[PDB]
Each structure stands twice: as C-alpha cells, then as structure tokens.
Amino acid sequence: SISQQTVWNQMATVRTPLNFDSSKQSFCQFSVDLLGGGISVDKTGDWITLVQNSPISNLLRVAAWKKGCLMVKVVMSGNAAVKRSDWASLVQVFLTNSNSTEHFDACRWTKSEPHSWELIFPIEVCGPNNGFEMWSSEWANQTSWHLSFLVDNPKQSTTFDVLLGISQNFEIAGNTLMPAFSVPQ
C-alpha cells in the first residue's frame, strides 16, 4: 500500500485577469473541471490559467473509469499590497457535478479572509458501471465534479492554486486516448 505524508499534486493555477475592469462589473468567474482536467473562464479579461502535468493531473485525464475518494485543497494567494484594513473582497466556491445551470450544488462555501486562505475538502467518485463513473459520458448520462468560483473584486483575491491528493481506495479502469499534453517553458 504505497503512501507518503504531505504529498499532494498540483492540478491548476488560475490567475485573475490583470486587465479586469471594475467599472464594467465587480466580479468575475472561472470553473475547474476536477475530473476532466479543464479550466473555464470569463470574457471579463485576459485570464492566466494553467493545468500542471503532475502525476495526478495526468492520471485523471487519461483514466476512463474512476471510483473512490480524492482530496481537494484550494489556496488563494492575494494582493499583498492592499492594507488589511482596506480588504473588500470575497470569493464564493461551489461544487456541482455539472456546469449546467439546472444542476443544484453539492456544496457551497464563501471565503473572505484577507490576503490569503485555504480550503480543504474531499470529493468522491460514484458511478453506474460498477460504482465506476466515466467523465461526462452520455452513457448513463454520467457526470463529473466541477469547482466553480465567483471572485468579487479580482484585484485583491488574485490567485488560486488547486492541489489534489489521491486516497488509498481510488481505483480506475480503462484508458482514454488523449492528445499530447503540452509541456510549458
């Protein structure tokens, strides 16, 4: 039973748009598809997003059928230049199994700590195959797990890192053919 303490894997890093224009609207939104590996963003500005090709990130994108628990950790690193007394920002986090607006939320959080905060919670994959689930498959109208954010005042709550930890019971089967993963720099 392979295991080691304190070793998560980086999954994504979303940087709020630098040219966000407060005057148009005050918040902006992005969503991370935890099991499919994609990041979605606003047309609110030029987002700087990135999905790291870490071991867990590569595994999930290529594992056809999944089942079991995963651990999620979100770390918001904000604008250190704002004085603590002028902090006027908050971010709403949502866990939904689909991006469709017709699906209710599995969970919901709202974080507003100044400069930085972290959020850790587990998610579990349950599917119809044999408890296995295929990412957004049309088969039994399967689904995924999306983590959506509504950042209010993107100039203070600027950065988000999403890390994932695999559990002892995570189990997969089958392979999904994917195009080459692009290596940065």
Binding site: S1, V7, Q52, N130, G174, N175
Partner: protein, 370 residues
C-alpha cells in the same frame, strides 16, 4: 384453441450462445496500400462501427441483446511472402477525447496486438470492452466512445506487387468477460503495464549500434514540447521509487530476410559504446527463426540492487543518470541480401513482485522514446 401469448418465450434475456459461425457479428476489410509507411493509420474509428459491418448470423443479436457476457473476439487475416515484412497493430481503448494521439505508445496499453504478416498469417485476439465489469453491449460501446485503431507500426520492408487488404472477422466469444481494474495506491501482482519502450533499428553492417532504454519509465513518453500518456503508465508515475521482475516482449517488425543477433543486458548510462566486456554482465542473446516474430525476455529483480526513481529530470545526462538502463546491441552483424534495417519493437509487458516506495510530486516533461 386460443394461444396464450404470455406463456410464449419472447422475453429471453440470455447472452448469445453457439458455434463461431453462429456467433459471427461483423467483418471489416482494412486496406493496406503497397506504399504504406509506418506511423500510418490504416483505420481509426469507434469500435461500434467495426462491429456493425455486414449482416452475419449474430448481427441482430448484437443489436438486440441488452447484456452480452462473452468477450469480443477478432480473427485478422493476411499473408505476405518471407522476403518482405510489415508490422501492424490493432489497438483497443475505452474512450477517446479530441484529436488523440495514434502513436504506438499511446494506443497499446489496454488491449493491443502487434503482428508481422510475414510470420503470423492469421492472428486472434479476445478482449473485454468493459474493464470494470463482466458484460458489455452495443449501446454501451456507442455512447461510451470505445475506440479501435489499426495502424502500421513499421512500413513494408519490400513493397508488394499490388495493394493488400487485411480482413477481420468479429465474433462474440464463448469465454466470459472478466474485469481488470487498477487500485492506484495498491498495485496487484503482476502489475500490467504494457508500456512501449521504443522501436529499435539496427542498420546492415558490422556496427554495434548500442541502444539505451532508460528504466525510469514514469511521466509518459516524450514528444515535441509535450508528453504522451496512457493509463497504466500514469499509475506507475504516482509512485516515487520502484523495482520488480521486468518482462519484455520483443517483436521482429521487419522481413524474415534481415538477420541479426541482438544482445540484451542491464547496465548504467555511463558506459561507452565500445566497452569491450559488456557481455561480462548477465545477458541474453536473441535470434529469430524465419517465421518467428515474438520473443519474451524476463529480467529478474536480482539484476537490480535497489529500487530506482520512477521519474528523472528529462535533461539528465547519461553520465549523471543513476537509474538502470536496458541495453540492446548487435552481437555479430546485421546482414541481408535485400535492403533494409533490422527493426525490433520492445514492450514492457508486466512487472512481477513489484515493490514501490513513496508518492511522487512529479517532474515536468519526459524523454523521447525510440
């Protein structure tokens, strides 16, 4: 006088059963041009589309039965003379997203067979399209995206007179489906890896042509500013260090007319190509018979003193690499009366009695395969 409709056996939920003729569901004819080159995709489509060509005896059963328990069995057929050769691969994968890679490395991890028609003129393969369980169905195959790629791994050694055609007969097998799942932090024994190690080419002549294949196989296969990746290789990359009895499957992908004795052994990256006593290390000599195309090498874990890194920084040099390598070199010479290099393909099949330590944070990128 009145028949009782209810008593009729019209709702029989049983799986298809019978002889091969009775269980034949489809037939595909794949075209193989005389000028095919290797890397060439002969046909890449949804499996459901291959299983749906032609109205054979069990064709409407395939379409009208909700659960099929037999595996899918295919019988590929095509013969070519001994003075030529080509290596074909028929690969099966659970799903596909976008313009996925068709490289032999990416496609051969689930259920895939590589054969050389100059040696094997009829090839059979059976598989379970649903690894999580013991049954499948045509709807499941369609809505799930189960994929099939038939590619040419190595082109013709000598081109045929005319164009060729490979015929594949598809059947529902009598053997039942069995699941194959991977518990990431708890590998089974043996661990089924199915990682392509590379395509080795040894040009005709007296040259040694030393080949070095790193055993730090985590992180996928390198590509141009990208990495290729398949599921089993992805799970092995989760661990930090590993060891095990390694089993390689070596295939002759070239014509039976190009002879060569290859020598395999384990050694470190820093040895010069001209090291005289490479063969003082435990080694194995491989020669193929005319019609023989597959050989299985098994490297015991006593060839390894310690577990090694699952992943090494891609730019690491041969001098600074501290992980073992699988070497391959020419023992005598690569000779023939027709032009062409002697080419073999190496695939790390399973790892037995494996032992892994720690979790891997990950290293960015990976080295290119052969």
């Amino acid at each position: 006088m009145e028949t009782n409709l209810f008593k009729l056996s019209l709702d029989d939920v049983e799986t298809p059963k019978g002889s091969m003729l009775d269980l034949k569901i489809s037939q595909s004819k794949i075209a193989l041009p005389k000028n095919t080159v290797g890397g060439t995709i002969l046909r890449s489509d949804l499996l459901a589309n291959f299983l749906t060509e032609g109205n054979f005896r069990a064709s409407v059963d395939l379409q009208r039965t909700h659960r099929i328990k037999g595996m899918i069995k295919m019988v590929a057929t095509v013969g070519i003379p001994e003075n030529t050769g080509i290596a074909l691969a028929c690969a099966m994968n659970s799903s596909i997203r976008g313009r996925a890679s068709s490289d032999i490395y990416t496609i051969c991890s689930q259920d895939c067979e590589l054969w050389n028609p100059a040696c094997t003129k009829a090839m059979t393969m059976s598989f379970n399209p649903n690894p999580c369980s013991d049954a499948w169905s045509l709807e499941f195959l369609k809505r799930t995206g189960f994929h099939c790629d038939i590619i040419c791994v190595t082109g013709w050694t000598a081109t045929p007179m005319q164009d060729v055609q490979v015929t594949i007969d598809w059947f529902i097998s009598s053997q039942e489906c069995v699941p194959r799942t991977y518990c990431v932090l708890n590998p089974q024994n043996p661990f089924v890896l199915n990682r392509w190690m590379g395509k080795l080419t040894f040009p005709q002549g007296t040259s040694r042509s030393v080949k070095r294949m790193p055993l730090s196989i985590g992180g996928g296969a390198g590509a141009k500013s990208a990495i290729l990746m398949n599921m089993p290789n992805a799970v092995l990359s989760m661990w930090r260090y590993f060891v095990g009895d390694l089993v390689f499957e070596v295939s002759k992908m070239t014509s039976p007319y190009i002879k060569c004795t290859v020598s395999f052994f384990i050694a470190f990256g820093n040895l010069a190509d001209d090291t005289i006593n490479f063969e003082a290390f435990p080694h194995k000599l491989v020669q193929f018979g005319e019609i023989q195309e597959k050989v299985v090498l098994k490297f015991s874990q006593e060839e390894f003193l310690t577990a090694w890194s699952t992943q090494v920084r891609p730019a690491t040099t041969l001098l600074a690499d501290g992980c073992p390598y699988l070497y391959a070199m020419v023992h005598d010479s690569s000779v023939s009366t027709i032009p062409g290099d002697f080419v073999i393909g190496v695939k790390l099949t399973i790892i037995e009695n494996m032992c892994a330590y720690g979790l891997n944070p990950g290293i960015s990128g990976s080295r290119l395969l052969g």
